[PDB]
Write a protein that binds this ligand. Structure first.
Ligand SMILES: [Mg+2]
Ligand SMILES: [Mg+2]
Ligand SMILES: [Mg+2]
Ligand SMILES: [Mg+2]
Length: 65
RNA sequence: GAUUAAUAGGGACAGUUGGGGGCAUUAGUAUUUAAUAGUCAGAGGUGAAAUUCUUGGAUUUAUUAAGGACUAACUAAUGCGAAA
């Protein structure tokens, strides 16, 4: 099966925490996730990675995706 | 032998008030730029895009540092200064 990497600790009553940084410009949007110490990057998705037209590099749609 | 003492003016004095001024000092974020790490393909900019920047790593996140300016929010028909 899958080889996850989250620390060795599950539990449908044990919450995991990830600090999501979100910068919203009128041109581009960023969505970042990182340790609660913010020194090790995990996930990084920006509107640009989501659409073709530079004007849409902001969009509500690009934010959804 | 020298008028009063001008809701005239000059001085003394008394607590007090002010973003008045001159030297010191002292911060605070932010903008840059640099280090230390962190990823990952796009950043940035416009109505649209375009020159611009970028896996000899950008934008990005955390810590920290250097530097020059600036004093936010409180800051309002409120204050001070002859005015600037
Ligand atoms: Mg003073
Ligand atoms: Mg610029
Ligand atoms: Mg400094
Ligand atoms: Mg005042």
């Amino acid at each position: 099966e899958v080889i996850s990497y989250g620390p060795p600790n599950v539990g449908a009553n044990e919450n995991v925490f990830g600090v999501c940084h979100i910068m919203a410009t009128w041109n581009d949007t960023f969505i970042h996730v990182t340790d609660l110490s913010g020194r090790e990057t995990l996930v990084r998705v920006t509107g640009g990675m989501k659409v073709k037209a530079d004007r849409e590099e902001s969009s509500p749609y690009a934010a959804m995706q």
